Amino acid sequence: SALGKLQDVVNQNAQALNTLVKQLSSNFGAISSVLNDILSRLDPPEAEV
Amino acid sequence: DSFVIRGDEVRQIAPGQTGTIADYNYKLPDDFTGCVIAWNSNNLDSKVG
Amino acid sequence: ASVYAWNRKRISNCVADYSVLYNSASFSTFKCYGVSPTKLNDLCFTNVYA
């Protein structure tokens, strides 16, 4: 644990990137989190929503 | 735009509708602005034969 | 069947042409909720029930 100050910064940046990548898996109230599924399932008036 | 249709087909003169005269007779855009006007004309556009 | 004893039929292992359902004018109401009616020929399904 001698080099914890640099490893803390590296872990925080990697964890922020991992959280940002993980947030794509959330649908945020939509029917799906995949854009291709919405574009292949729905008409543009409701796929727009 | 004036035409004569059935009584159940007046729902298809609208943006974002799926239907028959919407696809092959008269299509409205998704960004349509304006008013659709419909009234019964059984006394004028119908014959006993 | 009646609505209290509504009949559930399994649909599996078939290729389905929904265009004869869309192009038929015999249905007074043809309303889809989680999927577009015109995309039904482009997708694959399981657990289809009537």
Side-chain angles (χ1 to χ4, degrees), chain A residues 1-7:
Chain A
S1 60
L3 276 300
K5 294 185 68 37
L6 315 177
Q7 194 65 63

Side-chain angles (χ1 to χ4, degrees), chain B residues 15-45:
Chain B
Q17 282 295 323
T18 53
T20 59
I21 62 170
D23 294 348
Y24 306 141
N25 295 265
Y26 185 80
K27 179 76 180 79
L28 287 178
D30 296 344
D31 54 349
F32 170 66
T33 186
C35 305
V36 295
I37 322 299
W39 74 96
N40 200 310
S41 67
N42 196 46
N43 58 336
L44 299 173
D45 290 325

Side-chain angles (χ1 to χ4, degrees), chain C residues 24-45:
Chain C
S24 183
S26 299
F27 305 124
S28 312
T29 301
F30 183 77
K31 187 201 306 184
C32 303
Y33 272 76
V35 65
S36 171
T38 187
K39 303 288 183 171
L40 294 174
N41 277 41
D42 302 336
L43 311 185
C44 280
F45 304 106

Side-chain angles (χ1 to χ4, degrees), chain A residues 12-35:
Chain A
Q12 284 184 290
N13 286 310
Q15 169 203 261
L17 294 174
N18 285 341
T19 300
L20 187 72
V21 170
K22 181 64 68 68
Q23 280 297 98
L24 291 179
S25 71
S26 289
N27 47 42
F28 304 104
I31 54 159
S32 187
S33 61
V34 182
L35 277 176

